[PDB]
Structure 1
Amino acid sequence: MKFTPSIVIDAPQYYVDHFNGKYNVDKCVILRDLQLETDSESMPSSLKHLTKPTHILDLTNNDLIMIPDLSRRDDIHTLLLGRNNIVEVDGRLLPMNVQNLTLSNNSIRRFEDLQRLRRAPRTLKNLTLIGNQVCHLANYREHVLRLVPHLETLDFQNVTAEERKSAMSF
């Protein structure tokens, strides 16, 4: 149920396809540094036993409410958050060099809830929010661009200077 180190030790640990490295988390449930899939992760915690060797984190298909409780992980480049219930984002996330975030199919409602993504310095190049209610709200794309200009590709679409300028105009 809980993400605990006993679970941290023994999931299917291997190397991504992309050759991204990691060591996974499954004594009986939810995982980390690879395939954190399908074990009903309520709250992220106990990332310390990850002890840094992980490029990627496939959190998908859990019951995560928010994204806090991230120990300092220099190595983590990619977070695959899909199919959870992320309502909010922490803010002091700042895991330096988090290049990719996958928020697909979650429950982030408001633009303002997206604000904490601006904190990601210049590393968050790829962000995908598609599948959230916030996407339907007006001027969603432009607000994400003006809020986090660090993003190079949003919703698998590329930013482009045209809508950068429109984001400036509004």
Structure 2
Amino acid sequence: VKLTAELIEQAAQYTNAVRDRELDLRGYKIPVIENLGATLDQFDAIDFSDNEIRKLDGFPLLRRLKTLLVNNNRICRIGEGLDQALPCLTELILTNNSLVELGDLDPLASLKSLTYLSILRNPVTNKKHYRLYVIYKVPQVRVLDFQKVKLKERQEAEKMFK
């Protein structure tokens, strides 16, 4: 059950709780996120929860994409061309993923508009100084794992590994 144009044209699309145009693509078990050109950047949020996506890549240019729900998936790697395809990506929910190393968070630093990031329920969050490395690598993010970044955490991230 791969993501095609007929699956995106038959999927439900409505208004979310934040008054944004969201398309519900849950319950599809798509192994790879592709063929997203049929939406023509008419959705403000993408609900791709409960899927089997392994890599968050292969997305076309969508300037209206501001929220991406990748919860309950097996995402273990992030694409390096995420900034060239989503310049206005501000919300990224990557809870309960397959990220084990902090080096997968290195392509996530290119998103300058990203402010809300969720990396909870992951083996990469259980490593030593994971939050300090995420604050040092991504200074544009203001809320990490439902927690506001303070000045002391930014000073601790800028002190170590400088």
Would you say same fold, with TM above 0.5? yes
Q: How does 1:38-117 map to 2 (within 5 A)?
A: 38-94=27-83, 95-117=86-108
Quote the sequence identity (%).
Answer: 26
Tell me whether 7-16 or 51-60 shows the greater mean CA deviation.
Answer: 7-16
Matched, 1:124 2:137: no
- The aligned counterpart of 2:14 is 14
Aligned-partner residue type, residue 94 of structure 2? L
SS in 2 for 1:134: coil
1:80 is displaced (CA, Å) by 0.8
Tell me, yes or no, if the aligned pair for 2:78 and 2:107 is still in contact at 8 Å. Answer: yes
Matched, 1:140 2:130: yes
- The aligned counterpart of 1:169 is 159
Aligned-partner residue type, residue 98 of structure 1? L
1:20 is displaced (CA, Å) by 0.3
SS in 2 for 1:132: coil
Unmatched 5+ residue regions in structure 1? 23-33
Tell me, yes or no, if the aligned pair for 2:74 and 2:98 is still in contact at 8 Å. Answer: yes
Tell me, yes or no, if the aligned pair for 2:136 and 2:154 is still in contact at 8 Å. Answer: yes
Can you list the C-alpha shifts for 1:13-36, whole angstroms capped at 9, x where unaligned? 2111211014xxxxxxxxxxx212
- Distance between the aligned counterparts of 1:81 and 1:146, measured in 2? 23
SS in 1 for 2:101: coil
- Distance between the aligned counterparts of 2:24 and 2:21, measured in 1? 12
SS in 2 for 1:135: coil
Matched, 1:151 2:154: no
- Distance between the aligned counterparts of 1:150 and 1:61, measured in 2? 28
- Where has structure 1 moved over 3 Å in runs of 4 or more? none
Specify which structure has the higher proportion of strand.
2
| Paired residues, number | 158
Unmatched 5+ residue regions in structure 2? none
> Normalising to structure 1: TM-score of the pair?
0.91
Can you list the C-alpha shifts for 1:64-92, whole angstroms capped at 9, x where unaligned? 00000010000010001100000100011
